[model samples]
Target: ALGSRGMRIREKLEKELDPVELEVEDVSYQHADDGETHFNLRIVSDAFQGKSLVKRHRLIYDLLQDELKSGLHALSIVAKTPAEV
Candidate 1:
């Protein structure tokens, strides 16, 4: 199950990315669960096409800046194009 804040994170990513394939996992249940802070993101979208790995990571980083600065910890991200995944 997902916590409220983690759900919002998934919502925002979904809204902004318009991903063809997206999976947002609330990993806090296996971790500290302090504020339900851990998460994993797997995104497959055309938006990442032709972009370098750093660029893909940076884009996601910018989108989740708020959560990163807050209590969010251990965000494991896998960003790729539909073809790549």
Candidate 2:
């Protein structure tokens, strides 16, 4: 299931970034009829402190490259540092 994919994605991020806070919200309900699930993630990590928005998104995409290649259709992320919060 997509939930499993999301979990894997989160695990990968946690291992790679060691975030201070991570929140993954399944927004698949908005597109339930579309077959593929969607998610909105709010990730707060010290690693993101000096990163640009594009860089942050790139990091996430790179981390989940395999899943995206396979079947992850939609992922919206809010990547921020504690100072940005």
Candidate 3:
């Protein structure tokens, strides 16, 4: 049940960030589903090149603002640059 939705979020990251590495998880059973909650995101990309950890988080947070408002209960984001990975 969490398959396609996680992959959908995964695809969006790949397309928008062209990440060196990326992962998006829908752990909705621990939170909420239906495109609404329980997410974990790990992203590594030059898109975050020169950005601070807070800025990196802010960027990812901003990207999912709609989801947060809609009912996204928890978002665990692990963001990194290529060199860090």
Off by over 4 Å in 1: none
> Which lDDT tens digits does candidate 2 get at residues 1-85?
4467777877888999898998877677887634346778899999987788999999898887887888777889999998988
Candidate 3 residues lying further than 4 Å off, grouped into runs, are 1-5, 32-36
- 10 residues in a row with least lDDT, candidate 3: 28-37
List the pairs of residues colliding in candidate 3: none
Number of clashing residue pairs, candidate 3: 0
Predictions in order: lDDT: 0.85, 0.82, 0.76
Best by lDDT: 1
Q: Which sequence of candidate numbers ranks them by TM-score, best first?
A: 1, 2, 3
lDDT over C-alpha atoms for residue 59 of model 1 = 91
lDDT of 2: 0.82
lDDT of 3 by residue, 1-85 (tens): 4565466567777887899887777777664335536788889998998998899988877776766675566778899888987
Q: What is candidate 1's TM-score against the reference?
A: 0.87
Instruction: List clashing residue pairs in candidate 1.
Output: none
Deviation in Å, model 2, residue 52 alpha carbon: 1.1
